[PDB]
Amino acid sequence: HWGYGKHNGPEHWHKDFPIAKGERQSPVDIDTHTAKYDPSLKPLSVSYDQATSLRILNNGHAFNVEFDDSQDKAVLKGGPLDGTYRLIQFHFHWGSLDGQGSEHTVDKKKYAAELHLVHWNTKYGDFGKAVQQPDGLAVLGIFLKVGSAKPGLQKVVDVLDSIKTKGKSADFTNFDPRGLLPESLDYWTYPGSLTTPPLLECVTWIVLKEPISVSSEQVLKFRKLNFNGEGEPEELMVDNWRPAQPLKNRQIKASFK
Numbered sequence: 001h002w003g004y005g006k007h008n009g010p011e012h013w014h015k016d017f018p019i020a021k022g023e024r025q026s027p028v029d030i031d032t033h034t035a036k037y038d039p040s041l042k043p044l045s046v047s048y049d050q051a052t053s054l055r056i057l058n059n060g061h062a063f064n065v066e067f068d069d070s071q072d073k074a075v076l077k078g079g080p081l082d083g084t085y086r087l088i089q090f091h092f093h094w095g096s097l098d099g100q101g102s103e104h105t106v107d108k109k110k111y112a113a114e115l116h117l118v119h120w121n122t123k124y125g126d127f128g129k130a131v132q133q134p135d136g137l138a139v140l141g142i143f144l145k146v147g148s149a150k151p152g153l154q155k156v157v158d159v160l161d162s163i164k165t166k167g168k169s170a171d172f173t174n175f176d177p178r179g180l181l182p183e184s185l186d187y188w189t190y191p192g193s194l195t196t197p198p199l200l201e202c203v204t205w206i207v208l209k210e211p212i213s214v215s216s217e218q219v220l221k222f223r224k225l226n227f228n229g230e231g232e233p234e235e236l237m238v239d240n241w242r243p244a245q246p247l248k249n250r251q252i253k254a255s256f257k
């Protein structure tokens with residue numbers, strides 16, 4: 001029964017998920033002055049040309065665009081990673097207002113939203129096994145700011161009417177996630193967690209420095225989604241972000257100077 005409300009939100013999650021107070025929780029504030037350039041990170045490789053999107057789902061917490069992850073089709077490699085990580089889904093976190101919505105922050109700045117491209121390490125065979133390992137997942141995080149429209153997002157925006165409420169899905173084939181990337185792949189990286197329950201400490205985070213721009217109309221449509229199921233009282237799907245957690249004994253590394 002966790003969620004984002006006053007009585008079931010982030011401050012309550014630790015009761016059912018004690019790892020919420022663990023040693024490598026996400027998100028975090030990225031202090032740009034304290035992050036250290038690491039000249040050894042290897043180049044980062046996003047290989048999405050053969051991606052096969054399948055479906056879009058409103059799961060009651062966000063919406064997921066799901067991919068075929070039964071073969072190496074859309075993979076993330078390089079950067080801080082050893083081995084090959086397959087794209088399983090992407091989703092967003094966003095605010096009720098343009099001045100909040102991101103999970104990570106940059107020098108305490110909040111963005112309007114944050115895109116998470118979720119990948120799992122093929123050495124563990126399936127996603128469910130991967131989330132049980134400290135190097136099971138690699139999540140590419142991309143900030144959204146409100147300005148110019150993002151053309152490659154509009155297909156997502158357009159389908160949201162058909163998945164308004166929890167449990168609804170729609171076909172979503174032939175979507176190209178390359179259309180959601182910024183120009184630069186400069187990034188910060190650190191070891192962390194899932195940002196929702198079960199909050200498992202299985203993620204290598206790779207957060208891009210360059211945001212993407214989306215229009216006010218695009219983010220407005222995200223805010224028309226519902227947390228509730230059909231035929232239940234309407235609760236707008238907004239503010240589905242966890243705030244920054246303690247960094248504890250971690251260092252954030254930068255791929256750039």
Ligand SMILES: [C]C1=[C][C]=C([B]([O])([O])[O])[C]=[C]1
Nearest residue numbers: 116118139193194195196
């Ligand atoms: C199952 C799952 C996958 C990814 C995430 B997140 O928000 O950390 O990308 C949370 C939960």
Ligand SMILES: [Zn+2]
Nearest residue numbers: 091093116195
């Ligand atoms: Zn997420």
